[PDB]
Design a protein around this motif. Sequence first.
Motif, PDB file in Angstrom:
ATOM      1  N   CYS A  19       0.767  -0.940   0.125  1.00  0.00           N
ATOM      2  CA  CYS A  19      -0.349  -0.103   0.099  1.00  0.00           C
ATOM      3  C   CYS A  19       0.888   1.318  -0.060  1.00  0.00           C
ATOM      4  O   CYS A  19       1.844   1.264   0.841  1.00  0.00           O
ATOM      5  CB  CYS A  19      -0.869  -0.165   1.488  1.00  0.00           C
ATOM      6  SG  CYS A  19      -1.890   1.125   0.878  1.00  0.00           S
ATOM      7  N   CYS A  47       0.939   3.238   3.696  1.00  0.00           N
ATOM      8  CA  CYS A  47       1.172   2.776   4.473  1.00  0.00           C
ATOM      9  C   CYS A  47       2.028   1.186   4.467  1.00  0.00           C
ATOM     10  O   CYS A  47       2.749   0.520   5.324  1.00  0.00           O
ATOM     11  CB  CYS A  47       0.511   1.968   5.357  1.00  0.00           C
ATOM     12  SG  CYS A  47      -0.762   0.661   4.583  1.00  0.00           S
ATOM     13  N   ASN A  68       1.818  -1.399   4.035  1.00  0.00           N
ATOM     14  CA  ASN A  68       0.777  -2.499   3.895  1.00  0.00           C
ATOM     15  C   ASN A  68       0.904  -3.650   2.749  1.00  0.00           C
ATOM     16  O   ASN A  68       1.080  -3.064   1.474  1.00  0.00           O
ATOM     17  CB  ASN A  68      -0.600  -2.724   4.483  1.00  0.00           C
ATOM     18  CG  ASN A  68      -0.247  -2.241   6.260  1.00  0.00           C
ATOM     19  OD1 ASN A  68      -0.026  -2.472   7.241  1.00  0.00           O
ATOM     20  ND2 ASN A  68      -0.884  -0.972   6.556  1.00  0.00           N
ATOM     21  N   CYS A 103      -4.197  -0.270   0.274  1.00  0.00           N
ATOM     22  CA  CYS A 103      -5.124  -1.622   1.068  1.00  0.00           C
ATOM     23  C   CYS A 103      -6.048  -0.554   0.841  1.00  0.00           C
ATOM     24  O   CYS A 103      -6.808   0.701   0.614  1.00  0.00           O
ATOM     25  CB  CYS A 103      -4.010  -1.832   2.201  1.00  0.00           C
ATOM     26  SG  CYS A 103      -4.338  -0.174   3.516  1.00  0.00           S
ATOM     27  N   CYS A 144      -6.398   2.023   4.011  1.00  0.00           N
ATOM     28  CA  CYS A 144      -6.074   3.135   3.640  1.00  0.00           C
ATOM     29  C   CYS A 144      -6.947   4.064   2.477  1.00  0.00           C
ATOM     30  O   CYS A 144      -6.879   4.984   2.657  1.00  0.00           O
ATOM     31  CB  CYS A 144      -4.019   3.534   2.858  1.00  0.00           C
ATOM     32  SG  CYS A 144      -3.059   4.022   3.609  1.00  0.00           S
ATOM     33  N   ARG A 179       0.913   2.290   9.966  1.00  0.00           N
ATOM     34  CA  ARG A 179      -0.322   3.156  10.311  1.00  0.00           C
ATOM     35  C   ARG A 179      -1.124   1.666  10.983  1.00  0.00           C
ATOM     36  O   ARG A 179      -1.264   0.642  10.555  1.00  0.00           O
ATOM     37  CB  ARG A 179      -0.745   3.025   8.516  1.00  0.00           C
ATOM     38  CG  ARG A 179      -2.599   2.827   8.650  1.00  0.00           C
ATOM     39  CD  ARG A 179      -3.256   3.628   7.096  1.00  0.00           C
ATOM     40  NE  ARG A 179      -2.748   4.998   7.503  1.00  0.00           N
ATOM     41  CZ  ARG A 179      -3.362   6.111   7.459  1.00  0.00           C
ATOM     42  NH1 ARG A 179      -4.399   5.719   6.221  1.00  0.00           N
ATOM     43  NH2 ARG A 179      -3.101   7.078   7.209  1.00  0.00           N
TER      44      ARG A 179
HETATM   45 ZN   LIG Z   1      -2.616   1.659   3.529  1.00  0.00          ZN
END
Ligand SMILES: [Zn+2]
Lengths: 52, 72, 1339
Positions: free
Chosen positions: B36, B39, B41, B57, B60, C266
């Motif tokens: 992502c 972030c 991820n 993702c 986000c 995050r």
């Molecule tokens: Zn994200």
Amino acid sequence: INKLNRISRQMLQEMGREPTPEELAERMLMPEDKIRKVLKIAKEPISMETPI
Amino acid sequence: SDEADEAYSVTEQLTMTGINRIRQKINAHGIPVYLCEACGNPIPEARRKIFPGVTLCVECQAYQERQRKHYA
Amino acid sequence: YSYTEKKRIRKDFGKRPQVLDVPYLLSIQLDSFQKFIEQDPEGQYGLEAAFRSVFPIQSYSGNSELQYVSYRLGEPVFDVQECQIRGVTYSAPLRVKLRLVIYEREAPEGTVKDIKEQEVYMGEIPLMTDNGTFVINGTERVIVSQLHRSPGVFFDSDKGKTHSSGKVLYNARIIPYRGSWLDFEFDPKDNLFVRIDRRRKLPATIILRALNYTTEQILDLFFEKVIFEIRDNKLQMELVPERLRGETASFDIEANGKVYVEKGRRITARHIRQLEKDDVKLIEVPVEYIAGKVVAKDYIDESTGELICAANMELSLDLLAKLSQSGHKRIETLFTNDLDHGPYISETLRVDPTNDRLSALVEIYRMMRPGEPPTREAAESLFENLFFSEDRYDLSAVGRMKFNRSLLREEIEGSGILSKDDIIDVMKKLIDIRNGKGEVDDIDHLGNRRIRSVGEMAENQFRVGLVRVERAVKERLSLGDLDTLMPQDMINAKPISAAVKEFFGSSQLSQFMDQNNPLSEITHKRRISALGPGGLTRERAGFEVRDVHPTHYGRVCPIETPEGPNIGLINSLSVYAQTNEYGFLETPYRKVTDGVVTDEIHYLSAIEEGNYVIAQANSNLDEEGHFVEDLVTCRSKGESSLFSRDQVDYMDVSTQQVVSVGASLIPFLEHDDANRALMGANMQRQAVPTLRADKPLVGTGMERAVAVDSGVTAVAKRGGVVQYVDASRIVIKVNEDEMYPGEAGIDIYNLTKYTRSNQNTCINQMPCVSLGEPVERGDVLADGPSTDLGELALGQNMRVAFMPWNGYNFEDSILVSERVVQEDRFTTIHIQELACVSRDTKLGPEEITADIPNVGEAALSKLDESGIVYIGAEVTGGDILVGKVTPKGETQLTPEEKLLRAIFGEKASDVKDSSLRVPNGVSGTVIDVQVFTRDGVEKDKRALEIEEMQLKQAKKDLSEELQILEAGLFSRIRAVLVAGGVEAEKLDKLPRDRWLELGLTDEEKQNQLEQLAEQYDELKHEFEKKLEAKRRKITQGDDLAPGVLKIVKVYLAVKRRIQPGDKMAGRHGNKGVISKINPIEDMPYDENGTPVDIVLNPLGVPSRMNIGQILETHLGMAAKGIGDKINAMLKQQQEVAKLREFIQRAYDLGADVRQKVDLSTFSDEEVMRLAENLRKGMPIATPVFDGAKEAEIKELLKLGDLPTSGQIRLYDGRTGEQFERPVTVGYMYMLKLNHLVDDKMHARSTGSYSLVTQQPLGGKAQFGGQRFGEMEVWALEAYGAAYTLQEMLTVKSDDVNGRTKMYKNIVDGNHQMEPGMPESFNVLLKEIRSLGINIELED
Ligand SMILES: [Zn+2]
């Protein structure tokens, strides 16, 4: 004219519905065509630019 | 013509250029990204299977769309 | 079955079983008015709730209170017929019994000692007739309901149209019914700014501070808390994991010593579950996570009482440094996230100039009225009266409901004044709309718009009048005159009556009742305008209200609007829509408990319906109320959807509940484009009544209700038998069981004969009953205009063929056959009124004598001796309807004309004639003439003739009616003298008037006989006094405009016949101008020999997606096929046997219909009247979204021997060779819109001219030249047409010498022109020169 307006407002709230000029001819001491004359004479002019 | 005959075309242009931008937000390309872009991820296999070429993702993306919703 | 429905029972398709019968269609008008005018002993609404609002009125402590006792509505001077005839407003006097009590100024608390009492006259209030219409100056008017924005709190967005970036701003208004507004506007930098009434914006928290709040509790109100602790090692924090849902950790989230998330991440839902499932109750992060937060509250030294850091302080490292030295362990910062819980009130604190309550009131007062010096408790007074006075500011009860609902308050009613609770809830809801939990309000959302109606608008104007009358009475009472003044010498009836009379007489919500039609009236009464005083205009709105919202469902018709300038502003009400107790529109819904759809209905409003899962009207049910699907189509919140079985909260009452009465008479509405049905309803609303009103062969069953609930039908008032019918009155011997105990009576209706509606159509009732025929309550006795046996017949179903046929229907035109014009099934009567007044010129009177100068005796065979045309004479254009001459003194004639006078010895008459002649083109029968005469004048011969006629007719009517009532009373008393008093036919010979004093027991029979005798004597006395009043009314002076001697009104009855240029229309929005009326031979004819009646163009079918017309054509051909079979059986007469068999087969014929009728319970002569009514063609009902699908239409086309595919092979009428490609021929219902051509076509060669700008005027409706505009000037300029333009701008319009020169040249065979100068230009020169400007034409 002022006499006319006052007596008209009075008859409107004393004689039930409204003053007929035949009735103003008695309520005032006038000749009943003087009254029609003075009524058609006291009105102001319509502005010719008043928009319908 | 008439009222209804031009109103049809106004509504029709409305509907067509309303379908087209919602359909252009759809991703049709292919470049798997796996991470992502905000972030990092790892975008799971399935959420990359539905929209190929998705580069965020779901978390986000929800964030970014919530931000979009107020025109910020 | 009703007797009027076994006459012609309409084969009804449509499968849904009706749960709630159609309401009374005129209910809003009648309901709201008679709620306005009614002795209702409480302040609910109406007049007395307008008297209590200002009564009692006290003096300024004057120990004298004028208190209200009651009122009463007088008797109307004139009933509505006389009120139209005289040009008066039909109304009722309004008496009020006030009472002046006085206390002398001693004690105790105003001793009531010297009181009075009176009956005062405050104004006349117009009255709503039995059909919801007013008569304001003899003209029918209708007060259209208004749709105005209700008081309350509203949240709007102003989406991306002020800031450059596009960020929306989310303001939140609070509009009270009376008082001051309050607005709450964000700014582009996310700053809450509260601006009291529309002047300058202020920061948000200044109003909070004025509420005696300070910063610490303000932050506690508007935020959540975060608590950092100095955990002996660099300020570790309190943590709950769901707060972080959307965080990007600036550290290593670790607990148990166990890293939950690596830094930078995050924060995920994953780590969310990790935290709480492992239950992290305190975290440790670095210090620069607290480095930038803000402190919640105050913080001051234990050392020297010095501030650690102020409340609402951005953090730093030194701030925690001094907190450590203070020993503080509780760092109260806020939980501010960019996404959900943003910091807005914090920064608005940063911008707040003031600091405490006094500073806030100072700023507020400086904003409210600047300049004056402020003062502590002065500003306190101003603020705490601004939104906290019972006197000044008030969100009324509806305002309070909208408030406590728009914030989700459990209560529904409360104060009329604001509160800290209210303003804080407002600010919270606003910032949480900004956060993204909530939504802005749609303005058109019908939960945000009330409905004044006629009563709720008349009472407000009455309140205006009463406010000025009370202020006058108060100022008069303060004058300590005496206890001699009675409360009629003090209170004037001018202001009240003037205000209410200018409301009713002139305002955008008082319109001419469109009346060209039954449907036109009934859909102009049920109209919901969005304009007028108190409502937005056209410019200012604007597409806020110009469109439909998902809460219009069942409240406002989505299709029926006037297309054109104001679309979506004059939305018309739907079928079942009611109004809430507040003013809000509500619609019914079946209550559907757990799985069963109960037949108890439940009126939901708009604000509530968006919190329920409402069902879908077309949702099947298994004989008990259980949906036979699992999932079921519903609409929960705006978006429709599928919902499971056990979730639906309500169902719809019936499938026509989305469309208005206008758009429910269309069959196959669900097969039409939306805008096509819109045009269709709008053009059905203009249909002109015909000579023979027919019926729809394809209708929707709403015809019956729309026609009954309209006024025009003369529906029965009580059961009984038709004793004597006639073309002008129906007499009904009522039953005994539906009879009143004493005062027997019999209902005698008089029918309105040929009289003109507002649109000059002829409105005239006709008896549909026959002598000896039973009638039941609610039946139909007489069809008005455009009704057939209590059905709405606006058109005629003709045999139409869809095919091009030779360009005669090229674009939209319509090729009508000559049978349409011979049969007179569009010949429509128009009654026109022509006036002729005798004024008082300065030269003297004007006469109306039958001697007029300069016209031969041949042109006067119509006028009688008295000057006015004979009633019944057939006049045409140019004839004289009235002969009036005005004195011309004096002529001062010409040269050679003088010689021509001398030569032939004539005398120019002292008079010239101005006599009333028929306008050119008109051709009709003078059907009535009235003569209004001023009171001073003496009536001529014709006026006294018409008074003779009127008096004799009033006597004859009153005596006919008293004789019918006499006969009923006599027969009832006789039927009492049949038992108990036995003279069986030893009573039918002695004097009937000797029955009020004849023999019986002294039983209840005797009490009845006494009561009936008293009824007889009362009838005599009453009709005598009525005749005396009526005669005095007939022979009593008429009132007239000042200067008018007498007035003569003529009523021609023109009879229009269909001709090329008229507009016709199906109901499906297929307009079209008839372009040729070709003979019969020339029309396409089917193989059997009958020609189509009207040829329509197919090409207008797929472009305009109205397949409703094709399916109505198929179903109409089917129905006329059934009618054909019935007629051949009933003409070739078989018997009741085969006939009943065929009708019974054609009456079952469907899917699971709701229309099981069986001709097993009929007579055998009660099937013959029926099957004769079904010989022209058997009607068919088709409810709007429940119609007859194509399977049933094939079935019915197969019942008759028509072709199943709906298409025939026509043969050409001119060459006789068959049209290949078989054509559609069916029966379509063609209206005739009264855009009639002969009110369209005009010309002008020369005529009058305006007085200042010497341009063509006409004015006689209409000799006006064409409005050769500016865009036409450019059309001529693009050409080289410079001479055409020049004569089109100088000699044709303005130049006063060029135009006479041009006329002379033309009549002298020379087409030259003297261009001269336009008068507009030299007038322009004179005006420019009338300023200080010199403008000449140099040479
Ligand atoms: Zn994200």
